[PDB]
Write a protein that binds this ligand. Structure first.
Ligand SMILES: O=C(O)[C@@H]1C[C@@H](O)CN1
Lengths: 342, 347
């Protein structure tokens, strides 16, 4: 007897970026803290197997994340979650935090109050406050208060064959970013350059992670440069972003965590102060509002408290049988990218 | 008006790794007096494109897989009808998707499952496809299709190319039209490491071949154009190795039923198979079909073959989609990063 054990997922997107939210049938993930759960997912073969089942073919596709809803361990939190992608499990994500909030409210798992509901999400990076503007059972907007974000290294350099010396910032916005001014590559962040930006982003991610090891100073489970995010500024002042994601695709959203990491660099450079906000646009022109709420410190260095505002849209529901002659999960380089061959 | 539109229910199935979602609920009326007319409508009317894009482009759809639209049978001999939706167009035929549809109908109980065997007669725009399903303990373990009459359009065509010199290929029909290309001419083999190169080559050739020749089924005006370029080879053990390339740029994970059907028509024309023969075919990922030649017939007064294609389907989930009045991306979209360079032209 099959279809005895089903996982139920709500299909949601935030400004174009898919965040499936697994709400029922999520297995127990070992670990005493959510950070330990993240570590286990990224180091235990059973966690890899679980992630691959959910995110590789035939159940998964190159675009989108699977958010595992997990029990809150912190009494202040309404729920916990970890983000699954084809590269690894990740601690944090703006677009996916909005998807989870949207899903929790629109499914009735959390009481929806109008005109505003506060949802406290627990991540491996810390608590993320999600303030939802609600109307008629609809979650219209969500503003996240992201985890304390900081600069790791400003103005780093790396030599490359195609562009010569590339300057970039290494910064933390819930995961670690290499932040790269795109004009250095002689490219603009526009749909026609998506393939070229992916190839550049992957080259850079691979090289940077070979040269330097980064870890959160208080949270050992968060390590490595997750993504290279290309950045520019539009004529009207908006921050244009293109987060590249292994094994080779771009974030459809303006990227919450990448904007948080970038905000830490803007503050370090004297270009923003608390109370400031601005727009960020993705490669497809979708938009977030990015705010600087205030300052804090992380392990002795200056840090920022970012806010990220965007909208989630529920577009369906999936039931996946957990209990096939392929089965495990597979990829091919045709749509997953050259790097997928690994 | 109403907040919610296009509420549809789909079974998630794959055949030897190739995804074929099957729409079993909320399917709207598709105009047309015949299934071929429905296919024409899907490929010509703005509302047909809207529906297809809704179902197959982001966020609801992804580069891999088809959506099979189950439709009311119009032929009284058929149990169900369907049309295949992909990011390039709607298509008349597909072996892997016929097996998905058969599997989904039986395993869901929408058609009563008989054991050890159930016969499901499927109507497509190309004609009736007999699906014989071996069924055991509530599961559809394998399906053998009797494909539509398949034939050669042109043998030994050639085309000049920058990278490969003169490429020899056959144009043939196996439910849709193929350009069939011996892969060794590219200096490549069909293996996962070459997937991206095969896609690029297949896309280049599809584009060039279609601007140079117009092909239409002689009895069915709605079936036109070269749908796919399928690279082919022969494994040491005699199996036919295939890699069907699909616009805007990916490979079939299955050995390809329609492509093997087209190829079978060329094998018969070259005197290399006779009725009763069968052989394996393998895809780029090593999944397998059994290909048989049942018999001979004619199309347009010229020789044609009746292929059989045997493979397995696997149901692995179910889902629902809807269209929220509030959603600004309800139309569907693509980006070249994972859909392919050619995706830039999808308006
Ligand atoms: O088996 C076949 O005929 C099909 C052709 C494409 O629909 C994908 N596989």
């Amino acid at each position: 007897m099959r279809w005895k054990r089903m996982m139920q997922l709500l299909d949601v997107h935030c400004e174009g970026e898919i965040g499936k939210v697994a709400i029922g049938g999520v297995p127990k993930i070992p670990g005493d803290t959510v950070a330990d759960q993240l570590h286990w997912l990224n180091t235990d073969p059973k966690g890899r197997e679980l992630r691959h089942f959910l995110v590789l073919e035939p159940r998964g596709a190159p675009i989108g994340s699977v958010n595992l809803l997990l029990p809150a361990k912190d009494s202040r939190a309404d729920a916990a979650f970890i983000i699954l992608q084809p590269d690894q499990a990740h601690a944090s994500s703006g677009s996916n935090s909005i998807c989870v909030t949207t899903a929790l409210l629109e499914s009735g798992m959390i009481e929806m109050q109008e005109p505003e509901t506060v949802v406290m999400l627990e991540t491996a990076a810390g608590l993320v406050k999600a303030v939802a503007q609600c109307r008629d059972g609809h979650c219209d907007s969500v503003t996240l208060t992201m985890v304390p974000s900081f600069v790791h290294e400003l103005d780093a350099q790396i030599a490359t064959e195609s562009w010569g010396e590339i300057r970039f910032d290494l910064a933390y916005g819930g995961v670690f970013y290499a932040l790269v001014d795109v004009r250095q590559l002689g490219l603009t962040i526009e749909p026609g350059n998506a393939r070229r930006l992916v190839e550049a982003g992957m080259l850079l991610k691979g090289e940077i992670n070979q040269r330097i090891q980064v870890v959160h100073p208080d949270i050992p489970a968060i390590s490595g440069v997750a993504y290279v995010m290309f950045r520019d500024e539009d004529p009207d002042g908006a921050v244009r972003t293109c987060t590249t994601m292994w094994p080779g695709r771009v974030d459809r959203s303006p990227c919450g965590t990448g904007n948080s990491a970038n905000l830490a660099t803007l503050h370090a450079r004297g270009r923003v102060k608390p109370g400031d906000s601005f727009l960020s646009r993705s490669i497809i022109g979708s938009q977030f509002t990015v705010g600087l709420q205030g300052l804090t410190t992380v392990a002795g260095r200056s840090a920022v408290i970012p806010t990220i505002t965007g909208r989630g849209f529920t577009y369906g529901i999936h039931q996946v049988a957990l209990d096939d002659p392929l089965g495990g999960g597979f990829v091919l380089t045709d749509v997953w990218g050259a790097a997928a061959e690994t």
